[PDB]
């Protein structure tokens, strides 16, 4: 269909691995040809996970005959069982494993695994990595979670975080700090830190908190229906959104909406004579839909940036994005290829391209200030420092990370403007 050199999302099985390795005691036994191991490298190196990603690969080098591949998958299931001792097993098929005729769950049941085995369907040719993560989450919630008694203290569930997320670690620290400072405890952050036991306990929290909608929204809906746990909707990225999120979780839990804004530096700093040059700067906004909508609110309100184009790479969340874009006077640019993004930036000629890894590079080729506000990123954008995005400290981060490229440009452009690079023009009266 197309020559894809840049693909924002990855294959569905990669998202399934995100969820699997996010958990503690969950093996993702995956049917896959020899070589499809490469994603373990992504997890090991980009995110720098000490322990190897707890996923196995029934690599069929050249016994592609269904009799053989089934045996490899079965053997790998059982081997992953008594090797890594997981409390539950995740089994699915990837790419050619979908092409090869296998019963990805029937065999897993047939081996009579005492630990629960969650059967996964991942259509490897019409879906993407965000879907895959969300669906794997839905599956583990169905299998493991079960309605039980509400905890005595209102417990909020941090639904959504997974591994290899955009700052899915500092961010949950920040959100937990805000929530517990208001008083609500967290029952079990479900992925990016939740044993299958934690998922078993997901039915005791009062009200869910959908941290990252894209990877976890379907689990949130299932929670609302089965577990009867209402889930919040607003993502607290920024200050305005953070206040709204605080009020919303207060209402869902019936508590006071106290906010520790003593850390809030971004409002005051943006409202400073030092940085009034920001007003009237077109910013192009790309990346996954949640982060883009939140960045839209921040750029338009907190910073006074005039947003020129909002696009996303996940079609699954297009409708909210087109709603928002019609809000901001623009039209959404939901796409999947880097070409249309390059064209949109070229035509609109922004001055601050907040976007995914590829938008960063598009910026650098075009000489426009760049920043990263989304999921597709290499190892560099996964920092060691405390760099959340939601919460008040997230607002501070947002401020500095977004302003830093513009300041780089300004002091760069100054050093050019300065006489060291400007002793080339002269005028003598009437020439």
């Amino acid at each position: 269909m197309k020559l894809t050199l840049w693909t924002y999302e990855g294959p569905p099985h990669v998202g399934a691995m995100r969820v699997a390795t996010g958990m503690t005691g969950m093996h993702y036994v995956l049917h896959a040809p020899q070589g499809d191991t490469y994603a373990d490298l992504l997890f090991t190196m980009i995110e720098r996970r000490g322990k190897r990603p707890p996923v196995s690969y029934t690599t069929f080098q050249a016994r592609d005959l269904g009799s053989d591949t089934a045996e490899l998958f079965q053997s790998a299931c059982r081997d992953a069982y008594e090797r890594f001792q997981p409390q539950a097993i995740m089994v699915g098929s990837s790419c050619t494993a979908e092409l090869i005729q296998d019963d990805t769950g029937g065999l897993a049941d047939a081996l009579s695994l005492p630990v629960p085995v969650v059967h996964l369907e991942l259509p490897s040719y019409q879906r993407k990595e965000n879907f895959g993560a969300d669906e794997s989450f839905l599956q583990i919630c169905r299998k493991l979670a079960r309605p039980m008694e509400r905890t005595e203290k209102v417990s909020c569930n941090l639904l959504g975080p997974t591994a290899l997320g955009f700052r899915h670690r500092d961010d949950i620290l920040e959100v937990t700090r805000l929530l517990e400072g208001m008083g609500i405890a967290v029952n079990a952050v479900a992925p990016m830190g939740a044993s299958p036991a934690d998922i078993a306990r997901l039915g005791a929290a009062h009200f869910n908190v959908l941290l990252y909608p894209e990877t976890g929204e379907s689990a949130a809906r299932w929670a609302e229906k089965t577990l009867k746990q209402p889930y919040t909707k607003t993502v607290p990225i920024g200050v305005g959104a953070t206040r709204d999120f605080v009020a919303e979780v207060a209402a869902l839990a019936g508590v006071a909406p106290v906010a520790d804004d003593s850390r809030l530096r971004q409002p005051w700093w943006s409202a400073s004579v030092d940085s009034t040059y920001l007003t009237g700067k077109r910013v192009f906004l790309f990346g996954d839909a949640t982060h883009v909508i939140a960045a839209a609110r921040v750029a338009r309100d907190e910073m006074g940036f005039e947003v020129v184009g909002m696009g996303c790479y996940n079609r699954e969340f297009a409708r909210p994005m087109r709603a928002a874009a019609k809000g901001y006077g623009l039209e959404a640019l939901v796409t999947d290829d880097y070409l249309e993004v390059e064209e949109a930036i070229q035509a609109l000629a922004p001055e601050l391209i907040l976007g995914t890894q590829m938008e960063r590079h598009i910026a650098k080729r075009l000489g426009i200030p760049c920043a990263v506000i989304s999921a597709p990123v290499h190892v560099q954008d996964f920092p060691a420092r405390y760099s959340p995005q939601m919460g008040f400290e997230g607002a501070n981060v947002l401020f500095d990370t977004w302003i830093h490229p513009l300041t780089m440009g300004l002091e760069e452009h100054l050093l050019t403007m300065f006489r060291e690079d400007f002793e080339f023009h002269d005028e003598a009266g009437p020439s």
């Binding site: 839905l138 169905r142 379907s218 809906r221 079609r315 909210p320």
Partner: protein, 264 residues
């Protein structure tokens, strides 16, 4: 427990599915009224909403993913928690090409697994066309509905043989040919003996149930039921007889061309 509600008439066999949904909602179990009949008359008879939205054509959005939520396409309306109607894109609505439209297939691959108590499967309107027999893939307790008209009972027998045709691997059972006769026709009785099927809740008519109008409602939600309790009588019992396939009267349809029973 998928209950494919077959038949010939438009408003017939479609009011019936809504009555099944109402009875099963009274029974409490979640119900999946997927109508998708070309006549916007399947979710109408249960919700009262004649044509809420036809998004199952997916024109405003290009493909399935765009609907981050089911709320746009699926609808609740009344106790029928899931009343959704595809409508079909024939030459009547848009271009169409084949009258398949594969909309039944779109509901097959719709969104995420909203399983609940499987599906009640109003569905249908395909009956037969080579390559336009999609609903057969999820049919599990397919039931054919007929009025007194001989064309309609022929429609039954044809459908039963046709479902046995494709259900070479699906092997859908048919617990009974619940009908929609109006005048207690003994010809349909002789047929039910001939087809060796089960038809107990077939007294539902097109005249006795407020003439099967399109302004009022069905079963519990409409005014004072029907003839005090006539509507409930056959339909609560249907939700206590066919509520599962515990009585699999599934035979071989017509044993040997037992259609030449025109009489008069």
């Amino acid at each position: 427990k998928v209950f494919a509600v077959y038949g010939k008439g438009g408003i017939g066999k479609s009011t019936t599915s809504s009555n099944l949904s109402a009875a099963f909602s009274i029974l409490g179990k979640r119900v999946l009224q997927i109508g998708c009949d070309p006549k916007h008359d399947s979710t109408f008879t249960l919700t009262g909403s004649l044509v809420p939205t036809v998004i199952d054509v997916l024109k405003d959005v290009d493909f399935h993913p765009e609907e981050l939520r089911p709320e746009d396409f699926v609808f609740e309306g009344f106790n029928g928690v899931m009343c959704v109607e595809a409508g079909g894109p024939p030459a009547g609505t848009g271009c169409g090409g084949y009258v398949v439209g594969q909309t039944v297939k779109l509901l097959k691959q719709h969104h995420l697994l909203d399983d609940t108590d499987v599906v009640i499967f109003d569905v249908l309107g395909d009956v037969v066309c080579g390559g336009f027999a999609a609903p057969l893939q999820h049919a599990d307790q397919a039931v054919v509905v007929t009025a007194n008209d001989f064309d309609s009972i022929y429609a039954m027998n044809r459908i039963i043989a046709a479902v046995q045709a494709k259900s070479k691997n699906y092997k859908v059972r048919l617990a009974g040919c619940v009908a929609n006769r109006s005048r207690a026709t003994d010809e349909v009785d002789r047929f039910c003996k001939e087809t060796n099927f089960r038809r107990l809740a077939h007294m539902p008519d097109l005249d006795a149930i407020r003439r099967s109008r399109l302004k009022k409602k069905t079963l519990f939600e409409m005014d004072e039921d029907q003839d005090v309790l006539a509507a409930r009588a056959e339909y609560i019992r249907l939700a206590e007889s066919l509520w599962r396939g515990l009585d699999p009267i599934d035979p071989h349809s017509l044993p040997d061309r037992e259609i030449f029973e025109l009489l008069g």
